[PDB]
Amino acid sequence: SKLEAILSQEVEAEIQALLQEAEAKAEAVKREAEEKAKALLQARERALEAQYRAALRRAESA
Amino acid sequence: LWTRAQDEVARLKALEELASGRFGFALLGYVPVKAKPKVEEALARHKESV
């Protein structure tokens, strides 16, 4: 009862701190997912920029 | 040093004779009626009188 509450709140605090660091692990997963997302979108930005920039170059020369 | 070592070794050998309950522990003893007050005073000195 009393000792239930004491030891169970202890296990609560331990696994709550550890599972919020696991939430920080999930947040680093989301962080790197945003990193890959911005690398995807910005590399596609550079790709469309360079491709249609060279297309303007080619239409200019023609 | 040998007195403190015998005290700690007796504590280890007595804790070997305990009963653990997976982050819990059981204890069973036999003490006379003439020392029930000091036993209750020692048991009050637990974490919350566990």
Side-chain angles (χ1 to χ4, degrees), chain A, chain B residues 5 10 14 19 21 24 26 29 32 35 37 42 44:
Chain A
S1 65
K2 176 173 70 68
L3 190 59
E4 279 184 347
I6 293 168
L7 290 174
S8 190
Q9 186 177 2
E10 177 66 30
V11 175
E12 181 184 2
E14 292 292 329
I15 205 64
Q16 184 173 0
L18 183 60
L19 283 176
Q20 288 182 357
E21 289 181 354
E23 287 176 355
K25 179 73 174 177
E27 186 178 0
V29 169
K30 298 292 175 63
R31 180 68 179 270
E32 295 174 355
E34 293 294 329
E35 288 171 354
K36 296 295 186 291
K38 64 96 180 178
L40 184 65
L41 290 174
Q42 288 162 355
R44 287 168 181 266
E45 283 172 352
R46 181 67 179 170
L48 293 174
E49 178 181 1
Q51 184 180 2
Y52 294 104
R53 180 77 270 168
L56 200 281
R57 180 68 63 194
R58 179 177 62 246
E60 179 181 1
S61 182

Coordinates of all heavy atoms in Angstrom, one line a residue, unseen atoms left out:
Chain A
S1 N 0.8 -1.2 0.0 CA 0.0 0.0 0.0 C 0.9 1.3 0.0 O 1.1 1.9 -1.0 CB -0.9 0.0 1.2 OG -0.2 0.1 2.4
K2 N 1.3 1.6 1.2 CA 2.3 2.7 1.3 C 3.6 2.4 0.6 O 4.1 3.2 -0.2 CB 2.6 2.9 2.8 CG 3.7 3.9 3.1 CD 3.8 4.1 4.6 CE 4.4 2.9 5.3 NZ 5.8 2.6 5.0
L3 N 4.1 1.1 0.7 CA 5.3 0.7 0.1 C 5.1 0.5 -1.4 O 6.0 0.7 -2.2 CB 5.9 -0.5 0.7 CG 7.3 -1.0 0.4 CD1 8.3 0.1 0.7 CD2 7.5 -2.2 1.3
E4 N 3.9 0.0 -1.8 CA 3.4 0.1 -3.2 C 3.6 1.4 -3.8 O 4.2 1.6 -4.9 CB 1.9 -0.3 -3.3 CG 1.5 -1.8 -3.3 CD 0.0 -1.9 -3.5 OE1 -0.7 -0.9 -3.4 OE2 -0.5 -3.0 -3.8
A5 N 3.0 2.5 -3.1 CA 3.1 3.8 -3.7 C 4.5 4.4 -3.8 O 4.9 5.0 -4.8 CB 2.2 4.7 -2.8
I6 N 5.3 4.1 -2.8 CA 6.7 4.6 -2.7 C 7.5 4.0 -3.9 O 8.1 4.7 -4.7 CB 7.3 4.3 -1.4 CG1 6.6 5.2 -0.3 CG2 8.8 4.7 -1.4 CD1 7.0 4.8 1.1
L7 N 7.6 2.6 -3.9 CA 8.4 2.0 -4.9 C 7.9 2.1 -6.3 O 8.6 2.2 -7.3 CB 8.6 0.5 -4.5 CG 9.5 0.3 -3.3 CD1 9.6 -1.2 -2.9 CD2 10.9 0.8 -3.6
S8 N 6.5 2.2 -6.4 CA 5.9 2.3 -7.7 C 6.1 3.7 -8.3 O 6.3 3.9 -9.5 CB 4.5 1.9 -7.6 OG 3.9 1.8 -8.9
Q9 N 6.1 4.7 -7.4 CA 6.4 6.1 -7.8 C 7.9 6.2 -8.2 O 8.3 7.0 -9.1 CB 6.0 7.1 -6.7 CG 6.1 8.6 -7.1 CD 5.7 9.5 -6.0 OE1 5.3 9.1 -5.0 NE2 5.7 10.8 -6.3
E10 N 8.8 5.5 -7.5 CA 10.2 5.4 -7.9 C 10.4 4.9 -9.3 O 11.1 5.5 -10.1 CB 11.0 4.6 -6.8 CG 12.4 4.5 -7.2 CD 13.2 5.8 -7.1 OE1 12.8 6.7 -6.4 OE2 14.2 5.9 -7.9
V11 N 9.7 3.7 -9.6 CA 9.8 3.2 -10.9 C 9.2 4.1 -11.9 O 9.6 4.2 -13.1 CB 9.2 1.7 -10.9 CG1 9.1 1.1 -12.3 CG2 10.0 0.8 -10.0
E12 N 8.1 4.8 -11.5 CA 7.5 5.8 -12.4 C 8.5 6.9 -12.7 O 8.6 7.3 -13.9 CB 6.3 6.4 -11.6 CG 5.6 7.5 -12.4 CD 4.5 8.1 -11.6 OE1 4.3 7.8 -10.4 OE2 3.7 9.0 -12.1
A13 N 9.2 7.5 -11.8 CA 10.1 8.6 -12.1 C 11.3 8.1 -12.9 O 11.7 8.8 -13.9 CB 10.6 9.2 -10.7
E14 N 11.8 6.9 -12.6 CA 12.9 6.3 -13.4 C 12.5 6.1 -14.9 O 13.2 6.6 -15.8 CB 13.4 5.0 -12.8 CG 14.1 5.2 -11.4 CD 15.4 5.9 -11.5 OE1 16.1 5.7 -12.6 OE2 15.8 6.5 -10.5
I15 N 11.4 5.4 -15.1 CA 11.1 5.1 -16.5 C 10.4 6.2 -17.2 O 10.4 6.3 -18.4 CB 10.2 3.8 -16.5 CG1 10.3 3.1 -17.9 CG2 8.7 4.1 -16.2 CD1 11.7 2.6 -18.2
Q16 N 9.9 7.2 -16.4 CA 9.4 8.4 -17.1 C 10.6 9.3 -17.6 O 10.5 9.8 -18.7 CB 8.5 9.2 -16.1 CG 7.9 10.4 -16.7 CD 6.9 11.1 -15.8 OE1 6.6 10.6 -14.7 NE2 6.2 12.2 -16.2
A17 N 11.6 9.5 -16.8 CA 12.8 10.2 -17.3 C 13.4 9.5 -18.4 O 13.8 10.1 -19.5 CB 13.8 10.4 -16.1
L18 N 13.5 8.1 -18.4 CA 14.2 7.4 -19.4 C 13.3 7.4 -20.7 O 13.8 7.4 -21.8 CB 14.5 5.9 -19.0 CG 15.2 5.1 -20.0 CD1 16.5 5.7 -20.4 CD2 15.4 3.6 -19.6
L19 N 12.0 7.3 -20.5 CA 11.1 7.3 -21.7 C 10.9 8.7 -22.3 O 10.6 8.8 -23.4 CB 9.8 6.6 -21.4 CG 9.9 5.1 -21.4 CD1 8.6 4.5 -21.0 CD2 10.4 4.6 -22.7
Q20 N 11.1 9.8 -21.5 CA 11.2 11.1 -22.1 C 12.5 11.3 -22.8 O 12.6 12.1 -23.8 CB 10.9 12.2 -21.1 CG 9.4 12.2 -20.7 CD 9.1 13.3 -19.7 OE1 10.0 14.1 -19.3 NE2 7.8 13.5 -19.4
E21 N 13.6 10.7 -22.4 CA 14.8 10.6 -23.2 C 14.6 9.8 -24.4 O 15.2 10.1 -25.5 CB 16.0 10.2 -22.4 CG 16.5 11.2 -21.4 CD 17.7 10.7 -20.6 OE1 18.1 9.5 -20.8 OE2 18.3 11.4 -19.8
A22 N 13.7 8.8 -24.4 CA 13.4 8.1 -25.6 C 12.4 8.9 -26.5 O 12.4 8.7 -27.7 CB 12.7 6.7 -25.2
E23 N 11.7 9.8 -25.9 CA 11.0 10.8 -26.7 C 11.9 11.8 -27.3 O 11.7 12.2 -28.4 CB 9.9 11.5 -25.8 CG 8.7 10.7 -25.5 CD 7.8 11.4 -24.5 OE1 8.1 12.5 -24.0 OE2 6.7 10.8 -24.2
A24 N 13.0 12.1 -26.6 CA 14.1 12.9 -27.3 C 14.8 12.1 -28.4 O 15.3 12.7 -29.3 CB 15.1 13.3 -26.2
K25 N 14.9 10.8 -28.2 CA 15.4 9.9 -29.3 C 14.4 10.0 -30.5 O 14.9 10.1 -31.7 CB 15.5 8.5 -28.8 CG 16.0 7.5 -29.8 CD 17.5 7.7 -30.1 CE 18.0 6.6 -31.1 NZ 19.4 6.7 -31.4
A26 N 13.1 9.9 -30.3 CA 12.1 10.1 -31.3 C 12.2 11.5 -31.9 O 11.9 11.6 -33.1 CB 10.7 9.8 -30.8
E27 N 12.5 12.5 -31.1 CA 12.6 13.8 -31.6 C 13.9 14.1 -32.4 O 13.9 14.9 -33.3 CB 12.5 14.8 -30.4 CG 12.5 16.3 -30.7 CD 12.4 17.1 -29.5 OE1 12.4 16.5 -28.4 OE2 12.3 18.3 -29.6
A28 N 14.9 13.3 -32.1 CA 16.1 13.3 -32.9 C 15.8 12.6 -34.2 O 16.4 13.0 -35.3 CB 17.3 12.7 -32.2
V29 N 15.0 11.6 -34.2 CA 14.5 10.9 -35.4 C 13.7 11.9 -36.3 O 14.0 12.0 -37.5 CB 13.7 9.7 -35.1 CG1 13.0 9.1 -36.3 CG2 14.7 8.6 -34.5
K30 N 12.8 12.6 -35.7 CA 12.1 13.7 -36.4 C 13.0 14.8 -36.9 O 12.8 15.4 -37.9 CB 11.0 14.3 -35.5 CG 9.9 13.3 -35.1 CD 9.1 12.8 -36.3 CE 8.2 11.7 -35.9 NZ 7.2 12.2 -34.9
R31 N 14.0 15.1 -36.1 CA 15.0 16.2 -36.4 C 15.7 15.8 -37.7 O 15.9 16.6 -38.6 CB 15.9 16.4 -35.3 CG 17.0 17.5 -35.5 CD 16.4 18.8 -35.6 NE 17.4 19.9 -35.8 CZ 18.0 20.5 -34.8 NH1 17.7 20.3 -33.5 NH2 18.9 21.5 -35.1
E32 N 16.3 14.5 -37.7 CA 17.0 14.1 -38.9 C 16.0 13.8 -40.1 O 16.4 13.9 -41.2 CB 17.7 12.8 -38.5 CG 18.8 13.0 -37.5 CD 19.5 11.7 -37.1 OE1 19.0 10.7 -37.5 OE2 20.5 11.8 -36.3
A33 N 14.7 13.5 -39.8 CA 13.7 13.5 -40.9 C 13.5 14.8 -41.5 O 13.4 14.9 -42.7 CB 12.4 12.9 -40.3
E34 N 13.5 15.9 -40.6 CA 13.4 17.2 -41.2 C 14.7 17.6 -41.9 O 14.6 18.4 -42.9 CB 13.1 18.2 -40.0 CG 11.8 18.1 -39.4 CD 10.6 18.5 -40.3 OE1 10.8 19.3 -41.2 OE2 9.5 17.9 -40.1
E35 N 15.8 17.1 -41.4 CA 17.1 17.3 -42.1 C 17.1 16.7 -43.5 O 17.5 17.4 -44.5 CB 18.3 16.8 -41.3 CG 18.6 17.6 -40.0 CD 19.5 16.8 -39.1 OE1 19.9 15.7 -39.4 OE2 20.0 17.4 -38.1
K36 N 16.6 15.5 -43.6 CA 16.5 14.8 -44.9 C 15.5 15.5 -45.8 O 15.6 15.6 -47.0 CB 16.2 13.3 -44.7 CG 17.3 12.6 -44.1 CD 18.6 12.6 -44.9 CE 19.6 11.7 -44.3 NZ 20.2 12.3 -43.1
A37 N 14.4 16.0 -45.1 CA 13.3 16.7 -45.9 C 13.9 18.0 -46.5 O 13.6 18.3 -47.6 CB 12.1 17.0 -45.0
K38 N 14.6 18.8 -45.7 CA 15.1 20.1 -46.2 C 16.2 19.8 -47.2 O 16.3 20.6 -48.2 CB 15.6 21.0 -45.0 CG 16.7 20.5 -44.2 CD 18.1 21.0 -44.6 CE 19.2 20.5 -43.7 NZ 20.5 21.0 -44.1
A39 N 17.0 18.7 -47.0 CA 18.0 18.4 -48.0 C 17.4 18.0 -49.3 O 17.8 18.4 -50.4 CB 18.9 17.3 -47.5
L40 N 16.3 17.2 -49.2 CA 15.5 16.8 -50.4 C 14.9 18.0 -51.1 O 15.2 18.2 -52.3 CB 14.3 15.9 -49.9 CG 13.4 15.3 -50.9 CD1 14.1 14.3 -51.8 CD2 12.2 14.6 -50.2
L41 N 14.2 18.9 -50.4 CA 13.6 20.1 -51.0 C 14.6 21.1 -51.6 O 14.5 21.6 -52.7 CB 12.6 20.8 -50.1 CG 11.4 20.0 -49.7 CD1 10.6 20.7 -48.7 CD2 10.5 19.8 -51.0
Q42 N 15.7 21.3 -50.8 CA 16.7 22.3 -51.3 C 17.6 21.7 -52.4 O 18.0 22.5 -53.3 CB 17.6 22.7 -50.1 CG 16.8 23.6 -49.1 CD 17.5 23.6 -47.7 OE1 18.5 22.9 -47.5 NE2 17.0 24.4 -46.8
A43 N 17.9 20.4 -52.4 CA 18.6 19.9 -53.6 C 17.7 19.9 -54.8 O 18.2 20.1 -55.9 CB 19.0 18.4 -53.3
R44 N 16.4 19.7 -54.6 CA 15.4 19.8 -55.8 C 15.3 21.3 -56.2 O 15.2 21.5 -57.4 CB 14.1 19.3 -55.4 CG 14.0 17.8 -55.3 CD 12.8 17.3 -54.7 NE 12.7 15.9 -54.5 CZ 12.1 15.1 -55.4 NH1 11.5 15.6 -56.5 NH2 12.1 13.8 -55.2
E45 N 15.4 22.2 -55.3 CA 15.5 23.6 -55.6 C 16.7 23.9 -56.5 O 16.6 24.6 -57.6 CB 15.5 24.5 -54.4 CG 14.2 24.7 -53.6 CD 14.4 25.3 -52.3 OE1 15.6 25.5 -51.9 OE2 13.4 25.7 -51.7
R46 N 17.9 23.5 -56.1 CA 19.1 23.6 -56.8 C 19.0 22.9 -58.2 O 19.5 23.5 -59.2 CB 20.3 23.1 -56.0 CG 21.6 23.3 -56.7 CD 22.0 24.7 -56.8 NE 23.4 24.9 -57.4 CZ 23.9 26.0 -57.8 NH1 23.2 27.2 -57.7 NH2 25.1 26.1 -58.4
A47 N 18.4 21.8 -58.2 CA 18.3 21.0 -59.4 C 17.4 21.7 -60.5 O 17.8 21.9 -61.6 CB 17.7 19.6 -59.1
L48 N 16.2 22.2 -60.1 CA 15.3 22.9 -61.0 C 15.9 24.2 -61.4 O 15.8 24.6 -62.6 CB 14.0 23.1 -60.3 CG 13.2 21.8 -60.1 CD1 11.9 22.1 -59.3 CD2 12.9 21.1 -61.4
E49 N 16.6 24.9 -60.4 CA 17.3 26.2 -60.7 C 18.4 25.9 -61.8 O 18.4 26.6 -62.8 CB 18.0 26.7 -59.5 CG 18.8 27.9 -59.7 CD 19.5 28.4 -58.4 OE1 19.3 27.8 -57.4 OE2 20.2 29.4 -58.5
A50 N 19.2 25.0 -61.6 CA 20.3 24.7 -62.6 C 19.8 24.2 -63.9 O 20.3 24.6 -65.0 CB 21.3 23.7 -62.0
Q51 N 18.8 23.3 -63.9 CA 18.3 22.8 -65.1 C 17.6 23.8 -66.0 O 17.9 24.0 -67.2 CB 17.3 21.6 -64.8 CG 16.9 20.9 -66.1 CD 15.9 19.8 -65.8 OE1 15.6 19.5 -64.7 NE2 15.5 19.1 -66.9
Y52 N 16.7 24.6 -65.4 CA 16.0 25.6 -66.2 C 16.8 26.8 -66.4 O 16.6 27.6 -67.4 CB 14.6 25.9 -65.7 CG 13.7 24.7 -65.7 CD1 13.4 23.9 -64.6 CD2 13.1 24.3 -66.9 CE1 12.6 22.8 -64.6 CE2 12.3 23.2 -67.0 CZ 12.0 22.5 -65.8 OH 11.2 21.4 -65.8
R53 N 17.9 27.0 -65.6 CA 18.9 28.1 -65.9 C 19.7 27.7 -67.2 O 19.9 28.5 -68.1 CB 19.8 28.2 -64.7 CG 20.9 29.2 -64.8 CD 20.4 30.6 -64.6 NE 20.0 31.2 -65.9 CZ 19.3 32.4 -65.9 NH1 18.9 33.0 -64.9 NH2 19.0 32.8 -67.1
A54 N 20.1 26.5 -67.3 CA 20.8 26.0 -68.5 C 19.8 25.9 -69.6 O 20.2 26.1 -70.8 CB 21.4 24.6 -68.2
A55 N 18.5 25.7 -69.4 CA 17.5 25.7 -70.5 C 17.4 27.1 -71.0 O 17.2 27.3 -72.2 CB 16.2 25.2 -70.0
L56 N 17.4 28.2 -70.1 CA 17.4 29.5 -70.6 C 18.7 29.8 -71.4 O 18.7 30.6 -72.4 CB 17.3 30.5 -69.5 CG 16.8 32.0 -69.7 CD1 17.8 32.9 -70.2 CD2 15.6 31.9 -70.7
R57 N 19.9 29.3 -70.9 CA 21.1 29.4 -71.7 C 21.0 28.8 -73.1 O 21.4 29.5 -74.1 CB 22.2 28.7 -70.9 CG 23.6 28.7 -71.5 CD 24.1 30.1 -71.5 NE 24.3 30.6 -70.1 CZ 24.5 31.8 -69.8 NH1 24.6 32.8 -70.7 NH2 24.7 32.2 -68.5
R58 N 20.4 27.6 -73.2 CA 20.3 27.0 -74.5 C 19.3 27.7 -75.4 O 19.5 27.8 -76.6 CB 19.9 25.5 -74.3 CG 19.7 24.7 -75.5 CD 19.4 23.2 -75.1 NE 18.1 23.1 -74.4 CZ 18.0 22.8 -73.1 NH1 19.1 22.5 -72.4 NH2 16.9 22.7 -72.5
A59 N 18.2 28.1 -74.9 CA 17.2 28.9 -75.7 C 17.8 30.2 -76.1 O 17.5 30.7 -77.2 CB 15.9 29.1 -74.9
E60 N 18.6 30.8 -75.2 CA 19.3 32.0 -75.6 C 20.2 31.8 -76.8 O 20.2 32.6 -77.8 CB 20.1 32.6 -74.4 CG 20.9 33.8 -74.7 CD 21.7 34.3 -73.5 OE1 21.6 33.6 -72.5 OE2 22.4 35.3 -73.6
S61 N 21.1 30.8 -76.7 CA 22.0 30.5 -77.8 C 21.3 30.2 -79.1 O 21.7 30.6 -80.2 CB 23.0 29.5 -77.4 OG 24.0 29.3 -78.4
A62 N 20.2 29.4 -79.0 CA 19.5 29.0 -80.2 C 18.8 30.2 -80.8 O 18.7 30.3 -82.0 CB 18.4 27.9 -79.8
Chain B
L1 N 39.7 -3.2 12.4 CA 39.4 -3.5 11.0 C 38.8 -4.9 10.9 O 37.8 -5.1 10.2 CB 40.7 -3.5 10.2
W2 N 39.2 -5.9 11.7 CA 38.6 -7.2 11.7 C 37.3 -7.2 12.3 O 36.4 -8.0 11.9 CB 39.5 -8.2 12.4
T3 N 37.0 -6.3 13.3 CA 35.7 -6.2 13.9 C 34.7 -5.6 12.9 O 33.6 -6.2 12.7 CB 35.7 -5.2 15.1
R4 N 35.1 -4.5 12.1 CA 34.2 -4.0 11.1 C 34.0 -5.0 9.9 O 33.0 -5.1 9.4 CB 34.8 -2.7 10.6
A5 N 35.1 -5.8 9.6 CA 35.0 -6.8 8.6 C 34.1 -7.9 9.0 O 33.3 -8.4 8.2 CB 36.4 -7.3 8.3
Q6 N 34.1 -8.3 10.2 CA 33.2 -9.4 10.7 C 31.8 -8.9 10.8 O 30.9 -9.6 10.5 CB 33.7 -9.8 12.1
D7 N 31.6 -7.6 11.1 CA 30.3 -7.0 11.1 C 29.7 -7.0 9.6 O 28.6 -7.4 9.4 CB 30.3 -5.6 11.6
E8 N 30.5 -6.5 8.7 CA 30.0 -6.5 7.3 C 29.8 -7.9 6.7 O 28.9 -8.1 5.9 CB 31.0 -5.6 6.4
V9 N 30.7 -8.8 7.1 CA 30.6 -10.2 6.6 C 29.4 -10.9 7.2 O 28.7 -11.7 6.5 CB 31.9 -11.0 6.9
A10 N 29.1 -10.6 8.5 CA 27.8 -11.1 9.1 C 26.6 -10.5 8.4 O 25.6 -11.2 8.2 CB 27.8 -10.8 10.6
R11 N 26.7 -9.2 8.1 CA 25.6 -8.5 7.3 C 25.4 -9.2 6.0 O 24.2 -9.4 5.5 CB 25.9 -7.0 7.2
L12 N 26.5 -9.5 5.3 CA 26.4 -10.2 4.0 C 25.8 -11.6 4.1 O 25.0 -12.0 3.3 CB 27.8 -10.2 3.3
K13 N 26.3 -12.3 5.1 CA 25.8 -13.7 5.3 C 24.4 -13.7 5.8 O 23.6 -14.7 5.5 CB 26.7 -14.4 6.3
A14 N 23.9 -12.7 6.5 CA 22.5 -12.6 6.9 C 21.6 -12.2 5.7 O 20.5 -12.7 5.5 CB 22.4 -11.6 8.0
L15 N 22.1 -11.3 4.9 CA 21.4 -10.9 3.7 C 21.3 -12.0 2.6 O 20.5 -12.0 1.8 CB 22.0 -9.6 3.1
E16 N 22.3 -12.9 2.7 CA 22.2 -14.2 1.9 C 21.0 -15.0 2.3 O 20.4 -15.7 1.5 CB 23.5 -15.0 2.1
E17 N 20.6 -15.0 3.6 CA 19.5 -15.7 4.1 C 18.2 -15.0 4.0 O 17.2 -15.4 4.7 CB 19.8 -16.1 5.6
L18 N 18.1 -14.0 3.2 CA 16.9 -13.2 3.0 C 16.0 -13.8 2.0 O 16.2 -14.9 1.5 CB 17.2 -11.7 2.6
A19 N 14.9 -13.1 1.7 CA 13.9 -13.5 0.7 C 13.5 -12.3 -0.1 O 12.8 -11.4 0.3 CB 12.7 -14.1 1.3
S20 N 14.0 -12.3 -1.4 CA 13.8 -11.1 -2.3 C 12.6 -11.3 -3.2 O 12.3 -12.5 -3.6 CB 15.0 -10.8 -3.1
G21 N 11.9 -10.2 -3.5 CA 10.6 -10.3 -4.2 C 10.6 -9.4 -5.5 O 9.6 -8.7 -5.7
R22 N 11.7 -9.4 -6.2 CA 11.8 -8.7 -7.5 C 11.6 -7.2 -7.3 O 10.5 -6.6 -7.7 CB 10.9 -9.3 -8.6
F23 N 12.6 -6.5 -6.7 CA 12.6 -5.2 -6.2 C 11.7 -5.0 -5.0 O 11.1 -3.9 -4.8 CB 12.3 -4.1 -7.3
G24 N 11.5 -6.1 -4.4 CA 10.9 -6.2 -3.0 C 11.6 -7.2 -2.3 O 12.4 -8.0 -2.8
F25 N 11.4 -7.3 -1.0 CA 12.1 -8.2 -0.1 C 11.3 -8.5 1.1 O 10.6 -7.7 1.7 CB 13.5 -7.7 0.3
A26 N 11.3 -9.8 1.5 CA 10.6 -10.3 2.6 C 11.6 -10.7 3.7 O 12.8 -11.0 3.4 CB 9.8 -11.6 2.3
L27 N 11.2 -10.5 5.0 CA 12.1 -10.8 6.1 C 11.3 -11.5 7.2 O 10.1 -11.1 7.5 CB 12.7 -9.5 6.7
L28 N 11.8 -12.6 7.8 CA 11.1 -13.3 8.8 C 12.1 -13.6 9.9 O 13.2 -14.1 9.7 CB 10.6 -14.7 8.2
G29 N 11.7 -13.2 11.2 CA 12.6 -13.4 12.3 C 11.8 -13.8 13.5 O 10.6 -13.9 13.5
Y30 N 12.6 -14.1 14.6 CA 12.0 -14.5 15.9 C 12.7 -13.7 17.0 O 14.0 -13.9 17.1 CB 12.1 -16.0 16.1
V31 N 12.0 -13.0 17.7 CA 12.6 -12.1 18.8 C 11.8 -12.3 20.1 O 10.6 -12.5 20.0 CB 12.7 -10.7 18.3
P32 N 12.4 -12.1 21.2 CA 11.7 -12.3 22.5 C 10.7 -11.1 22.8 O 10.8 -10.1 22.2 CB 12.8 -12.4 23.5
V33 N 9.8 -11.4 23.7 CA 8.8 -10.4 24.1 C 9.5 -9.2 24.9 O 9.0 -8.1 24.9 CB 7.7 -11.0 24.8
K34 N 10.6 -9.5 25.5 CA 11.3 -8.5 26.4 C 12.1 -7.5 25.5 O 12.6 -6.6 26.1 CB 12.2 -9.2 27.4
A35 N 12.1 -7.6 24.2 CA 12.8 -6.7 23.4 C 12.0 -6.2 22.2 O 12.5 -5.8 21.2 CB 14.1 -7.3 22.8
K36 N 10.6 -6.3 22.4 CA 9.7 -5.8 21.4 C 9.7 -4.3 21.2 O 9.5 -3.8 20.1 CB 8.3 -6.3 21.7
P37 N 10.0 -3.6 22.3 CA 10.1 -2.1 22.2 C 11.3 -1.6 21.4 O 11.1 -0.7 20.5 CB 10.2 -1.6 23.6
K38 N 12.5 -2.2 21.6 CA 13.6 -1.8 20.8 C 13.5 -2.3 19.4 O 14.0 -1.7 18.4 CB 14.9 -2.4 21.4
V39 N 12.8 -3.4 19.2 CA 12.5 -3.9 17.8 C 11.6 -3.0 17.1 O 11.8 -2.7 15.9 CB 12.0 -5.3 17.9
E40 N 10.6 -2.4 17.8 CA 9.7 -1.5 17.1 C 10.4 -0.1 16.9 O 10.1 0.5 15.9 CB 8.4 -1.3 18.0
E41 N 11.3 0.2 17.8 CA 12.1 1.5 17.6 C 13.0 1.3 16.4 O 13.2 2.3 15.6 CB 12.8 1.8 18.8
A42 N 13.6 0.1 16.2 CA 14.5 -0.1 15.0 C 13.6 -0.2 13.7 O 14.1 0.3 12.7 CB 15.3 -1.4 15.2
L43 N 12.4 -0.8 13.8 CA 11.6 -0.9 12.7 C 11.0 0.5 12.3 O 10.7 0.7 11.1 CB 10.4 -1.9 12.9
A44 N 10.9 1.4 13.2 CA 10.4 2.8 12.9 C 11.5 3.5 12.2 O 11.2 4.5 11.5 CB 10.1 3.5 14.2
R45 N 12.8 3.1 12.2 CA 13.9 3.7 11.6 C 14.1 3.2 10.1 O 15.2 3.4 9.6 CB 15.2 3.5 12.4
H46 N 13.1 2.7 9.5 CA 13.1 2.3 8.1 C 12.9 3.5 7.2 O 13.0 4.7 7.7 CB 12.1 1.2 7.8
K47 N 12.6 3.3 5.9 CA 12.4 4.4 5.0 C 11.2 5.2 5.3 O 11.2 6.4 5.3 CB 12.4 3.8 3.5
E48 N 10.1 4.5 5.5 CA 8.9 5.1 6.0 C 8.2 4.2 7.1 O 7.0 4.2 7.1 CB 7.9 5.5 4.9
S49 N 9.0 3.5 7.9 CA 8.6 2.3 8.5 C 8.0 1.3 7.5 O 6.8 1.1 7.6 CB 7.7 2.5 9.8
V50 N 8.9 0.9 6.6 CA 8.5 0.0 5.5 C 7.8 -1.2 6.0 O 8.3 -1.8 7.0 CB 9.7 -0.2 4.6

